[PDB]
Amino acid sequence: TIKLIVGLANPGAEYAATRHNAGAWYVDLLADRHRAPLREESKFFGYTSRINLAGEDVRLLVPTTFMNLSGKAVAAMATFYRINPDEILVAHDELDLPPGVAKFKLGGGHGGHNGLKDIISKLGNNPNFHRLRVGIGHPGDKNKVVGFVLGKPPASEQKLIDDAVDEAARCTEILLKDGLTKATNRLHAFKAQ
Ligand SMILES: [Cl-]
Ligand SMILES: [Cl-]
Ligand SMILES: [Cl-]
Ligand SMILES: [Cl-]
Incomplete structure (x- = not known):
């Protein structure tokens, strides 16, 4: 069961169009789609909502922290509602997947993502939460990652990411209503088959 879906972001109009906000695009x-507009809830350091997904009560969070303090929002909300790490789905931009691809993951490393690193920390050094990895591709120069994730994608890459986010939203209904195997069998086939 998933009780909380988190879309990682930096705050402000300055970052709303940047690759590092891809997880928030998904939660938005x-x-x-569930007609549950996200509104500021300052005790959880973010924008929150609540939706019915496949007959299950699921809370939504897009932090208003800087990305490196995402764990403060996720822990405050998870602790308040007595939600355990394994009941959290964290959506984030993924350098290791191209634009147009998304995958689900349970546990594993942060892939150098400053928001995942802070969540692992603030959940008690527990990486065993679900992730939605929204592919953004990678810069040619591995030195220039910050400039890349804090950049706006070109229109052709934005259209691919929007398509992947649309598919991931559709697969989230399946994840809640029929489980992680079925949701993964669909989502990971999207550009693979
Ligand atoms: Cl950042
Ligand atoms: Cl990752
Ligand atoms: Cl790219
Ligand atoms: Cl850079």
């Missing part, structure tokens, strides 16, 4: 779409 869930909010739109």
Whole structure:
């Protein structure tokens, strides 16, 4: 069961269009599709909502922390509602997947993502939460990652990411209603088959 879906972000209009906000794009779409608009809730350091997904009560969070303090919002909300790490799905931009691809993951490393690193920390050094990895591709120069994730994608890459986010939203209904195997069998086939 998933009780909390988190879309990682930096705050402000300055970052709303940047690759590092890709997880928030996903959560914004869930909010739109379930007619549950995200609104500031300062005790959880973010924007929150609540949706019915496949007959299950699921809370939404897009932090208003800087990305490196995402764990403060996720822990405050998870602790308040007595939600355990394994009941959290964290959506984030993923350098290791191309634009147009998304995958689910349970546990594993942060892939150098400053928001995942802070969540692992603030959940009690527990990496065993679900992730939605939204592919953004990688810069050619591994030195220039910050400039890349804090950049706006070109329109052709934005359209691919929007398509992957749309598919991941559709697969989230399946994840809640029929489980992680079924949701993964669909999502990981999206550009693979
Ligand atoms: Cl950052
Ligand atoms: Cl990762
Ligand atoms: Cl790219
Ligand atoms: Cl850079």
